[PDB]
Design an enzyme around this catalytic site. Structure first.
Site, PDB file in Angstrom:
ATOM      1  N   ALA A 179      24.540 -34.776  22.998  1.00  0.00           N
ATOM      2  CA  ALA A 179      25.675 -34.349  23.805  1.00  0.00           C
ATOM      3  C   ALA A 179      25.234 -33.573  25.034  1.00  0.00           C
ATOM      4  O   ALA A 179      25.885 -33.653  26.081  1.00  0.00           O
ATOM      5  CB  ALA A 179      26.625 -33.500  22.962  1.00  0.00           C
ATOM      6  N   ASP A 191      -1.542 -36.377  63.439  1.00  0.00           N
ATOM      7  CA  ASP A 191      -2.546 -37.093  64.191  1.00  0.00           C
ATOM      8  C   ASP A 191      -2.182 -37.024  65.647  1.00  0.00           C
ATOM      9  O   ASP A 191      -0.979 -36.933  65.963  1.00  0.00           O
ATOM     10  CB  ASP A 191      -2.619 -38.526  63.685  1.00  0.00           C
ATOM     11  CG  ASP A 191      -3.493 -39.361  64.579  1.00  0.00           C
ATOM     12  OD1 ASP A 191      -4.925 -39.166  64.588  1.00  0.00           O
ATOM     13  OD2 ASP A 191      -3.011 -40.215  65.296  1.00  0.00           O
ATOM     14  N   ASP A 222      -6.032 -42.408  59.435  1.00  0.00           N
ATOM     15  CA  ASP A 222      -5.208 -41.447  58.714  1.00  0.00           C
ATOM     16  C   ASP A 222      -4.555 -42.040  57.472  1.00  0.00           C
ATOM     17  O   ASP A 222      -3.741 -41.366  56.837  1.00  0.00           O
ATOM     18  CB  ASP A 222      -4.150 -40.835  59.636  1.00  0.00           C
ATOM     19  CG  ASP A 222      -3.412 -41.865  60.451  1.00  0.00           C
ATOM     20  OD1 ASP A 222      -2.747 -42.736  59.856  1.00  0.00           O
ATOM     21  OD2 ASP A 222      -3.484 -41.791  61.695  1.00  0.00           O
ATOM     22  N   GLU A 236      33.312 -31.112  27.004  1.00  0.00           N
ATOM     23  CA  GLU A 236      33.149 -32.332  26.224  1.00  0.00           C
ATOM     24  C   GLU A 236      32.513 -32.053  24.870  1.00  0.00           C
ATOM     25  O   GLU A 236      32.726 -32.814  23.921  1.00  0.00           O
ATOM     26  CB  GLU A 236      32.306 -33.348  26.995  1.00  0.00           C
ATOM     27  CG  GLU A 236      32.984 -33.919  28.226  1.00  0.00           C
ATOM     28  CD  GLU A 236      32.007 -34.614  29.155  1.00  0.00           C
ATOM     29  OE1 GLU A 236      30.785 -34.501  28.933  1.00  0.00           O
ATOM     30  OE2 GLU A 236      32.461 -35.272  30.110  1.00  0.00           O
TER      31      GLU A 236
HETATM   32  C1  LIG Z   1      27.547 -35.488  28.439  1.00  0.00           C
HETATM   33  N1  LIG Z   1      27.430 -35.772  26.989  1.00  0.00           N
HETATM   34  C2  LIG Z   1      28.590 -36.533  26.447  1.00  0.00           C
HETATM   35  C3  LIG Z   1      28.891 -36.115  25.035  1.00  0.00           C
HETATM   36  C4  LIG Z   1      29.656 -34.987  24.776  1.00  0.00           C
HETATM   37  C5  LIG Z   1      29.927 -34.589  23.478  1.00  0.00           C
HETATM   38  C6  LIG Z   1      29.428 -35.325  22.416  1.00  0.00           C
HETATM   39  O1  LIG Z   1      29.684 -34.894  21.138  1.00  0.00           O
HETATM   40  C7  LIG Z   1      29.144 -35.665  20.054  1.00  0.00           C
HETATM   41  C8  LIG Z   1      30.177 -36.657  19.593  1.00  0.00           C
HETATM   42  C9  LIG Z   1      31.486 -36.587  20.059  1.00  0.00           C
HETATM   43  C10 LIG Z   1      32.416 -37.511  19.634  1.00  0.00           C
HETATM   44 CL1  LIG Z   1      34.042 -37.414  20.247  1.00  0.00          CL
HETATM   45  C11 LIG Z   1      32.089 -38.514  18.751  1.00  0.00           C
HETATM   46  C12 LIG Z   1      30.792 -38.598  18.277  1.00  0.00           C
HETATM   47  C13 LIG Z   1      29.846 -37.676  18.697  1.00  0.00           C
HETATM   48  O2  LIG Z   1      28.536 -37.713  18.301  1.00  0.00           O
HETATM   49  C14 LIG Z   1      28.071 -38.898  17.635  1.00  0.00           C
HETATM   50  C15 LIG Z   1      26.573 -38.847  17.565  1.00  0.00           C
HETATM   51  C16 LIG Z   1      25.802 -39.109  18.690  1.00  0.00           C
HETATM   52  C17 LIG Z   1      24.421 -39.019  18.635  1.00  0.00           C
HETATM   53  C18 LIG Z   1      23.795 -38.667  17.458  1.00  0.00           C
HETATM   54  C19 LIG Z   1      24.551 -38.405  16.335  1.00  0.00           C
HETATM   55  C20 LIG Z   1      25.931 -38.495  16.387  1.00  0.00           C
HETATM   56  C21 LIG Z   1      28.663 -36.455  22.657  1.00  0.00           C
HETATM   57  C22 LIG Z   1      28.400 -36.841  23.960  1.00  0.00           C
HETATM   58 MG   LIG Z   2      -4.120 -42.267  65.968  1.00  0.00          MG
END
Ligand SMILES: CNCc1ccc(OCc2cc(Cl)ccc2OCc2ccccc2)cc1
Ligand SMILES: [Mg+2]
Ligand SMILES: CCCCCCCC/C=C\CCCCCCCC(=O)OC[C@H](COP(=O)(O)OCC[N+](C)(C)C)OC(=O)CCCCCCC/C=C\CCCCCCCC
Ligand SMILES: CCCCCCCC/C=C\CCCCCCCC(=O)OC[C@H](COP(=O)(O)OCC[N+](C)(C)C)OC(=O)CCCCCCC/C=C\CCCCCCCC
Ligand SMILES: CCCCCCCC/C=C\CCCCCCCC(=O)OC[C@H](COP(=O)(O)OCC[N+](C)(C)C)OC(=O)CCCCCCC/C=C\CCCCCCCC
Ligand SMILES: CCCCCCCC/C=C\CCCCCCCC(=O)OC[C@H](COP(=O)(O)OCC[N+](C)(C)C)OC(=O)CCCCCCC/C=C\CCCCCCCC
Ligand SMILES: CCCCCCCC/C=C\CCCCCCCC(=O)OC[C@H](COP(=O)(O)OCC[N+](C)(C)C)OC(=O)CCCCCCC/C=C\CCCCCCCC
Ligand SMILES: CCCCCCCC/C=C\CCCCCCCC(=O)O[C@H](COC(=O)CCCCCCC/C=C/CCCCCCCC)COP(=O)(O)OCC[N+](C)(C)C
Ligand SMILES: CC(C)CCC[C@@H](C)[C@H]1CC[C@H]2[C@@H]3CC=C4C[C@@H](O)CC[C@]4(C)[C@H]3CC[C@]12C
Ligand SMILES: *[C@@H]1O[C@H](CO)[C@@H](O)[C@H](O)[C@H]1NC(C)=O
Ligand SMILES: *[C@@H]1O[C@H](CO)[C@@H](O)[C@H](O)[C@H]1NC(C)=O
Ligand SMILES: *[C@@H]1O[C@H](CO)[C@@H](O)[C@H](O)[C@H]1NC(C)=O
EC number: 7.2.2.19
Lengths: 983, 268
Positions: free
Chosen positions: A289, A335, A680, A745
């Site tokens: 995230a 130069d 150069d 977010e």
């Molecule tokens: C700028 N970044 C955007 C951004 C912000 C928040 C965020 O929260 C995590 C998350 C939110 C929601 Cl709604 C659903 C699923 C989520 O994770 C799933 C997940 C992802 C990777 C690994 C493990 C699990 C994720 C990306």
């Molecule tokens: Mg020259």
């Protein structure tokens, strides 16, 4: 080597003949033993390798790692028990797609720049004249081998490195290989010990200007001087750009924050009863995230917009990262020949009427002329026009006089162009005075003479005009034309002449003397038989007209460009292969050496003391030649660089240019190099940014360069510096804007995991925020004007002044994004309560809420809800959180316009692109909310109007708080507030 | 970055001031958020929700509620009592809340018409809710048959409509339950059901619902569907719809809106 050896010592190493050349069989055997006489083409790189390089970089690698983490967490969840895991796939796809599209865009930029630059590269077969077993035939240049006896004449490119055996008035153009601006004489006699400063060596790829020469090929192919320079350039490694270093530092900050937050909430999830696997998945989700999705695209678009602005000024960058290096640059190693100067001999000063005048040397003639209303001037102009054999090529009328092609020597070309510019119609003035006698320039007489007839038919007198070396002319000319009167030489005119000649010579200029002598009607009547083999005509007792001096002058915009660069705090160092006197004169002319600045030699000359007696701290200027540099260790080089602010390096080899650039970089400086010739190319490759001339630049220099000036306009350097500083500031603003929205977010997901409320914000709507609604507003910040006089500031400190720093990150996340999170949750709870779910009931509701087996869950009023109805309510929560974030981001983009000035001062509507971006963002939000099908396509709901209004006081709070903060910064510079709350 | 004198590029005194500033900022923001929530809850009506955007039609649930992997799935063995013991226990526990002891808080209801109450005339400033007792389900009430017809192969299914504040199904006739095969057996006859109460109707005096604060003793009227001709050893799908003027069951995204669909398999 081959130049210090004798003809007897030679002619046996290569089994050749100084008179007959090589035998054909032996030439074939040597052409097998060594390669063909050519440089090996660069290895290059496959197009797929070039594209794959665009997929690397710190931000790209962070995004690749985030996508990998998404896939690994998907594997864990799918292998344990978990449905609704499509969010990981969506995130991974978004990251990969952004990286790939950005790489494609950067590859397109590089392809376009390469095509534009290579359109200026042409191809012509090269042929040479060789002598074998007594024969003489025209053979291809790559067929030559060592020991070949070759023939060169004026206008023919030198086919290899050649030791001159015989020469007849041979001159060569070494300006691309060495720094020498004047044509150099090639003679069969050794005159130095370095091969680069001796007249018995001709160099491959140089041009023979006039005369004839014969010699033996002593070096071939990549073993030639230019081949050795190319090999040296191949061994120079191109370091990372300042903007790439800043991006890597930003990636380090982001990774540290992500790991800290993930570890903290992993501990929290452990403490609140989650399993280890679920807590690890939570940690991975948080780490992913923190990685922004659209930031890479935003940065690339901003860099491309800056590149487009630069290309509007005929300044092409070969890569997007190069548009900031000039803004970060603290040292410019320039130069001289062909870069600061026009690489063209031009009339600069005239000494007549006991005064030194100044001619207009600008290629556009937008300069200051001299007084052209004197009898002495009208005689001197006639003399220099008549005593000239140079001629323009036909078909040149719209081509300006300085750029017109003429047939003749460099000096005669300069005199002819001067005649055309000051007198006008030099051809007509020359034909109106018919020539009846002529003596060409030769090494013994060291002058040129001709006898003409006057234009007016009444006058039968024949005018004699003579041009030659100043002392060889003043030995004659018992009379001198002063203020329109023919005065004799009373030992005072002979000392005024000597003073003028010495001053012009010390100004690094080549001086010619001119004189005239009208012939009496009685002694030389019309029809007189002038004989060049009898010297019947008088060759003494003439009337001296004046001195004319010539130099390779600076380009028109160069002095002002150098002045602006020095005003911007940038140190300018001249590094040239040319002679120290010319180098110092040009440095004084272009402002590299300021008026009043003196070297140790100047101080010693003024104080009548030996050089070692003076203090080197009193000398602001310094001139170091290549021989002194060769005996100089790095400590002493650093000491000289620190001691003398205004520095000139003369007689500098390509390796020594590389060494100087390396020393300046080792001092911690960001170094720009501007050059045109092959000499150069290594320094251009080593520089943080290499700038090459487009028209005058060699192929090697343009290949080594990162930036090409197509029109050879040096003020484009000033434009690049300004645009680089502006894009640095605007990228800072755009990054702060982009980072702000990451916190609102993430916080809903943290509350969803820890407090167990129904999910306030979905992955799809997060992706829409990241990639569709905010990209245009973030990009529009690239159009912000400077908040101060950006060209009167010093270059930023690379160690301290970072693109993204702690105050920026802390402010943008944990104050503005915190306010946005509070706005989002206020709207979330409002929408929930107005539909029947009170906040306390929301706390801990997630398992029942998401249970597919509960179809009559009771709300705060006792109403029973199905799973589908609860899911539509959840989509409504998604939409209200989305709209809260968008409304707060409108205020965020308003406050990111400036870092110190007020929005009222900068102007709310001055950035029309920003206004349009805001309108577009609102329109897209409304379309997503109220288009039919959205609830089941993208899970956006048609929210009620009051849920648009809830986050508006928070947006106003953001704007007011930022305005108050910037007011506190402006009103109290240096206070705690300015030190802690300014980014 | 860490050092004795300047820890993480900041002295100890400066860390105090910056931490105090962040603490004050977050305290102010949390106070603003709490004020907003307080104003929201002060403007919320305690008896009637502001909006019912997602509650336009009532959901329908079924007892005993046993789920497979795509919805309700009931499967037992008339021979083997342990297969339907859990089902009959679920029905008994559900009907526990419809005994007279659990209905002491409601009153007798006979109007067969909308129980429109515009005043709080019930004890403790409430409104009257009308009784629904288990004995209204006759043979499917759990007495004298404690198996709810599962032992005999004619099981009883309790059908309950989700309650919505002030929702009105329509007063031209009482809302009615109608159960049928989703895809009629091409060999067997159509589904034969006996409904308790008679005709499978919900009496109109159970509506409208005024919420839990006004009617804390409210009980959803129930309809019992006794299925009488279910083939043995065969998967069948049953759909029970609510027939009313203002109840719709055509939602493609909510299969529980206005109807309930389950899978039934009875083995011999
Ligand atoms: C700028 N970044 C955007 C951004 C912000 C928040 C965020 O929260 C995590 C998350 C939110 C929601 Cl709604 C659903 C699923 C989520 O994770 C799933 C997940 C992802 C990777 C690994 C493990 C699990 C994720 C990306
Ligand atoms: Mg020259
Ligand atoms: C530039 C490259 C950036 C983005 C281009 C790729 C598109 C986004 C990346 C994810 C790819 C993807 O597959 O994304 C799918 C979603 C919509 O999925 P859906 O509702 O159709 O799935 C229905 C299936 N069910 C019912 C199970 C949910 O698209 C989205 O979120 C789009 C979100 C907004 C993207 C705007 C990009 C503008 C550039
Ligand atoms: C997801 C987003 C979708 C929407 C993207 C934009 C769609 C089209 C919307 C607007 C296009 C421009 C409309 C212009 C109308 C106003 C007329 C005008 O007067 O404007 C002409 C401008 C002049 O310049 P100025 O006076 O504003 O400069 C002043 C600042 N100074 C000098 C420092 C640079 O001409 C220019 O700027 C150059 C031409 C215009 C370029 C600016 C518009 C943005 C274009 C691309 C960036 C967005 C990329 C989309 C997402 C890509 C993801 C990878
Ligand atoms: C600059 C300001 C914003 C400009 C935005 C673009 C404007 C031009 C785009 C036009 C495309 C949309 C054309 C009209 C679509 C709506 C009318 C229609 O004919 O669509 C009907 C069907 C289904 O609707 P329904 O009434 O049966 O369901 C009832 C849904 N009730 C209950 C949920 C709300 O929609 C469907 O099946 C499929 C069609 C869904 C609509 C487009 C899907 C996404 C396409 C592009 C957007 C990409 C992300 C941005
Ligand atoms: C959202 C809610 C945010 C609430 C935050 C609570 C903050 C509490 C008050 C903080 C006071 C900060 C302060 O007292 O700092 C004083 C320092 C003293 O420095 P010095 O004299 O040693 O330096 C002299 C220069 N030398 C070093 C060379 C000698 O710096 C100065 O005096 C510089 C001037 C101090 C005032 C600058 C602006 C402070 C305003 C803060 C209010 C923020 C929220 C406004 C309302 C939000 C929107 C409704
Ligand atoms: C880094 C620092 C972060 C600090 C975040 C905020 C911390 C404090 C937040 C919540 C803790 C409780 C304090 C606030 C209480 C709300 C204000 C209040 O006094 O309200 C009064 C209500 C009680 O009224 P009633 O229902 O009895 O009246 C019924 C009246 N009739 C019947 C007419 C409807 O009390 C209630 O609602 C209590 C329910 C309120 C709590 C809901 C769940 C909050 C959970 C997560 C939200 C966090 C958002 C964080 C965003 C920023 C992140 C950086
Ligand atoms: C800056 C330039 C702006 C240009 C204008 C923006 C585009 C305007 C185009 C269309 C908007 C109106 C048509 C859509 C709404 C009616 C569809 C609907 O049906 O919405 C209904 C609500 O409507 C209303 O409350 C009244 C209309 C208000 C619309 C919101 C206002 C939108 C405007 C935003 C601009 C804000 C600008 C100021 C801040 C930024 C300054 C720079 C939704 O129904 P419901 O929730 O009761 O149903 C729930 C039952 N369930 C879920 C089963 C369907
Ligand atoms: C005490 C409660 C209200 C929270 C703390 C309020 C904060 C924001 C206030 C109260 C005391 C203030 C500090 C008092 C002492 C100093 C040291 C001085 O050299 C600069 C100002 C500075 C750094 C102030 C910064 C702002 C400050 C820390
Ligand atoms: C359960 O049903 C099967 C037929 O599907 C039957 O053979 C079996 O006898 C039944 N159970 C018992 C224990 O009788
Ligand atoms: C409610 O009315 C019914 C039918 O008249 C009656 O049998 C029952 O006893 C009444 N409820 C009471 C008083 O328990
Ligand atoms: C219900 O029980 C009564 C007797 O108590 C009987 O007359 C009626 O037929 C039964 N109906 C069913 C289908 O069990």
């Amino acid at each position: 080597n081959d130049h210090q050896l004798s003809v007897a010592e030679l002619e046996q190493k290569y089994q050749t003949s100084a008179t007959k050349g090589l035998s054909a069989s032996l030439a074939a055997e040597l052409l097998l033993r060594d390669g063909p006489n050519a440089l090996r083409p660069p290895r290059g790189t496959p197009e797929y390798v070039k594209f794959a390089r665009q997929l690397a970089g710190g931000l790209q690698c962070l995004m690749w790692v985030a996508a990998a983490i998404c896939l690994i967490a998907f594997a864990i969840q799918a292998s344990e028990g978990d449905l609704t895991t499509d969010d990981n796939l969506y995130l991974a796809l978004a990251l990969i797609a952004v990286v790939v599209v950005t790489g494609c865009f950067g590859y397109y930029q590089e392809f376009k720049s390469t095509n534009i630059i290579a359109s200026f590269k042409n191809l012509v077969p090269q042929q040479a004249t060789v002598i074998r077993d007594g024969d003489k035939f025209q053979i291809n240049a790559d067929q030559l081998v060592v020991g070949d006896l070759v023939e060169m004449k004026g206008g023919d490119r030198v086919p290899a490195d050649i030791r001159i055996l015989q020469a007849q008035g041979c001159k060569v153009d070494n300006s691309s290989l060495t720094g020498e601006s004047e044509p150099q004489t090639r003679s069969p006699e050794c005159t130095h010990e370095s091969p680069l400063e001796t007249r018995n060596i001709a160099f491959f790829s140089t041009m023979c200007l006039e005369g004839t020469a014969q010699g033996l090929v002593v070096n071939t192919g990549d073993r030639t001087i230019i081949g050795r320079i190319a090999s040296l350039a191949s061994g120079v490694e191109n370091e990372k750009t300042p903007i790439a270093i800043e991006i890597e530092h930003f990636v380090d900050i982001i990774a540290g924050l992500a790991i800290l937050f993930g570890a903290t909430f992993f501990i929290v999830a452990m403490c609140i009863g989650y399993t280890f696997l679920r807590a690890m998945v939570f940690f991975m989700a948080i780490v992913v995230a923190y990685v922004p999705e659209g930031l890479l695209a935003t940065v690339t678009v901003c860099l491309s917009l800056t590149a487009k602005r630069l290309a509007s000024k005929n300044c092409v960058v070969k890569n997007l990262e190069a548009v900031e290096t000039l803004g970060s640059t603290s040292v410019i190693c320039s130069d001289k020949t062909g870069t600061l100067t026009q690489n063209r001999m031009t009339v600069s000063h005239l000494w007549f009427d006991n005064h030194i005048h100044s001619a207009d040397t600008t290629e556009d003639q937008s300069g200051q002329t001299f007084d052209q209303s004197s009898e002495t001037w009208r005689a001197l102009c006639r003399v220099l026009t008549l005593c000239n054999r140079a001629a323009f090529k036909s078909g040149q009328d719209a081509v300006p006089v300085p750029k017109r092609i003429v047939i003749g020597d460099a000096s005669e070309t300069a005199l002819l162009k001067f005649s055309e510019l000051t007198l006008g119609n030099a051809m007509g003035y020359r034909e109106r005075f018919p020539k009846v006698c002529e003596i060409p320039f030769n090494s013994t007489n060291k002058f040129q003479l001709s006898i003409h007839t006057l234009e007016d038919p009444r006058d039968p007198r024949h005018v004699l005009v003579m041009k030659g070396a100043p002392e060889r002319v003043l030995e004659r000319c018992s009379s001198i034309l002063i203020k329109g009167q023919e005065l004799p030489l009373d030992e005072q005119w002979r000392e005024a002449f000597q003073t003028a000649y010495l001053s012009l010579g010390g100004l690094g200029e080549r001086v010619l003397g001119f004189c005239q002598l009208y012939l009496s009607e009685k002694d030389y009547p019309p029809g007189y038989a002038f004989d060049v083999e009898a010297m019947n005509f008088p060759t003494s007792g003439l009337c001296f007209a004046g001195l004319v001096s010539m130099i390779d002058p600076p380009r028109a915009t160069v002095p002002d460009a150098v002045l602006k660069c020095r005003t911007a705090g940038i140190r300018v160092i001249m590094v040239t292969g040319d002679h120290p006197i010319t180098a110092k004169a040009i440095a004084a002319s272009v402002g590299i050496i300021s008026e009043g600045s003196e070297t140790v030699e100047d101080i010693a000359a003024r104080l009548r003391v030996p050089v070692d007696q003076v203090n080197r701290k009193d000398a602001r200027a310094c001139v170091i030649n290549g021989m002194q540099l060769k005996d100089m260790d790095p400590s002493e080089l650093v000491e000289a660089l620190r001691t003398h602010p205004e520095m000139v390096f003369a007689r500098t080899s390509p390796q020594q240019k590389l060494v100087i650039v390396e020393s300046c970089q080792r001092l911690g400086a960001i170094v720009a190099v501007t050059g045109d010739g092959v000499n150069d190319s290594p320094a251009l490759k080593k520089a943080d940014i290499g700038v090459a001339m487009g028209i005058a630049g060699s192929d090697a220099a343009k290949n080594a360069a990162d930036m090409i000036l197509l029109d050879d306009n040096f003020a484009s350097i000033v434009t690049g510096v300004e645009q680089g500083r502006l894009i640095f500031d605007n990228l800072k603003k755009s990054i702060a804007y982009t980072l702000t929205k990451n916190i609102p977010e993430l916080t809903p997901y943290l509350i969803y995991i820890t407090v167990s409320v129904p999910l306030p914000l979905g992955c799809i709507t997060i992706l829409f925020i990241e990639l569709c609604t905010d990209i245009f507003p973030s990009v529009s910040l690239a159009y912000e004007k400077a908040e101060s006089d950006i060209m009167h500031l010093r270059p930023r400190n690379p160690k301290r002044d970072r693109l993204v720093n702690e105050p920026l990150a802390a402010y943008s996340y944990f104050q503005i994004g915190a306010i946005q999170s509070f706005a989002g949750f206020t709207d979330y709870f409002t929408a929930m309560a107005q539909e029947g779910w009170f906040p306390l009931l929301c706390v801990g509701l997630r398992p029942q809420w998401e249970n597919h087996h509960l179809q009559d869950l009771q709300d705060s009023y006792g109403q029973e809800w199905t799973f589908g109805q609860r899911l539509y309510q959840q989509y409504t929560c998604y939409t209200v959180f989305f709209i809260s974030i968008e409304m707060c981001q409108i205020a965020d983009v308003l406050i990111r316009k400036t870092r110190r000035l007020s929005a009222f001062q900068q102007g709310f509507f001055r950035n029309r692109i920003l206004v349009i971006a805001i309108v577009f963002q609102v329109c897209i939000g409304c379309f997503l909310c109220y288009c039919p099908g959205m609830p089941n396509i993208f899970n956006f709901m048609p929210i009620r109007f009051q849920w648009w209004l809830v986050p508006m006081p928070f947006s106003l709070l953001i704007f007011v708080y930022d305005e108050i903060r910037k007011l506190g910064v402006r009103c109290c510079p240096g206070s705690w507030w300015d030190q802690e709350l300014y980014y | 970055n860490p050092d004795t004198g300047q820890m993480l590029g900041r002295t100890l005194s400066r860390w105090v001031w910056i931490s105090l500033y962040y603490v004050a900022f977050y305290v102010v923001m949390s106070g603003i958020f709490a004020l907003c929530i307080y104003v929201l809850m002060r403007t919320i009506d305690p008896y009637t929700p502001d909006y019912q955007d997602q509650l336009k039609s009532p959901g329908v649930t079924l007892r005993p509620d046993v789920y497979g992997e795509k919805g309700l799935d009931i499967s037992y063995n008339v021979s083997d009592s342990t297969t339907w013991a859990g089902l009959a226990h679920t029905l008994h526990r559900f009907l526990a809340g419809y005994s007279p002891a659990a209905q002491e808080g409601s009153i007798n209801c006979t109007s067969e018409k909308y129980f429109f109450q515009e005043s709080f005339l019930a004890p403790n400033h409430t409104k009257f809710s009308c009784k629904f007792t288990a004995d209204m389900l006759q043979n499917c009430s759990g007495r004298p048959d404690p198996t709810f017809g599962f032992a005999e192969g004619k099981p009883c299914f309790i059908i309950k409509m989700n309650r919505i504040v002030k929702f009105l199904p329509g007063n031209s006739t009482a809302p009615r339950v109608d159960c049928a095969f989703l895809d009629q057996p091409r060999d067997g006859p159509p589904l034969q059901v006996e409904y308790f109460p008679a005709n499978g109707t919900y009496s109109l005096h159970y509506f409208p619902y005024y919420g839990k604060k006004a009617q804390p003793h409210y009980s959803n009227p129930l309809v019992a569907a006794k299925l009488l001709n279910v083939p043995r050893n065969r998967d069948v799908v049953i759909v029970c719809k609510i027939l009313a003027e203002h109840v719709s069951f055509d939602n493609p995204h909510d299969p529980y809106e206005g109807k309930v669909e389950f899978k039934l398999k009875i083995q011999k």
